[PDB]
Amino acid sequence: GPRAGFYRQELNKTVWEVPQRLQGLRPVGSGAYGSVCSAYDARLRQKVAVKKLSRPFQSLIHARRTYRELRLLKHLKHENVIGLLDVFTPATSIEDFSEVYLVTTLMGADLNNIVKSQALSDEHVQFLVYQLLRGLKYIHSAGIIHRDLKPSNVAVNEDSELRILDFGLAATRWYRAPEIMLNWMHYNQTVDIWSVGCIMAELLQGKALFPGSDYIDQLKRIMEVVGTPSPEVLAKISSEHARTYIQSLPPMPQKDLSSIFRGANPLAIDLLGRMLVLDSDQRVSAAEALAHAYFSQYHDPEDEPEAEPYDESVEAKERTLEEWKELTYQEVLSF
Ligand SMILES: CC(C)N1CCC(c2cc(-c3ccc(F)cc3Cl)c3c(c2)N(c2c(Cl)cccc2Cl)C(=O)NC3)CC1
């Protein structure tokens, strides 16, 4: 195990090489969860989660994406966002720098786990969804869009503390905004509010709101609740080419969400109604949603901070693979 004070083992067909401080590595699952282990960090003296990045410098865009992930994790430090406790590489020089390891808080569960193992009370949904929006307010205010928010990217520990995992870095399409589905090139932060809506719907009902079996079925299920858009709304939520997928559907009125969410807190229904809207910019913002009466138990404007804009200047400039690597290497070494 080349580097001093580091040891090697095989976990899910692949070699993990970690410092002696990291003990009892246990894979979370097989496949898409094959890059993450639970561990005990003997230096920090606590249980941790460790993520081995797949192939960080395989191409230009992967090198670029690796850098960005590191950057966002530092810039977006917040109570409801996952933050780095450690970062390392088995490399001793930039010449053998090919792997990056990220060490965070061990949360232990995601929102899927929460929905599966337990029926959720309305008061419990208020708390969970409050935190997710509070994390998202911060993310958005830095000028970052998640773009793929769903239950498996939202971590919750046994004290019901919630942290957002990842920022759309790189799957189910049940939580993706229609404008993303329809390849609208000019989407913004509001796409995540659609996802929050679907997530909140699922916490309340214990089941997915729009579980499409395929692309066309996904759009169908969606329109069958929210109604088909006017041409004017359709013009601002899709690529020209993707319009046919909505135009050739039968015209449908919006359903009454009181009939979909029968028995729910009328406040939840109201709010869901301001999130699950085709006209994207009519969607309530994360900051605005926090002020909604539904979260009136937990809302604290003084304690729902905004971020400084995320600085894009380094990534605005074109660099070689070998340069993104050197930038990432220094970023790792500086932790
Ligand atoms: C399939 C895709 C969508 N993805 C789902 C999320 C997974 C995932 C990633 C990360 C993560 C994120 C950023 C980072 F820098 C380092 C790490 Cl380790 C964590 C977790 C899970 N969990 C976790 C949960 Cl939430 C449930 C069970 C077991 C565990 Cl370990 C934590 O507790 N801590 C961090 C990775 C794969």
Ligand code: NA
């Ligand atoms: Na606080």
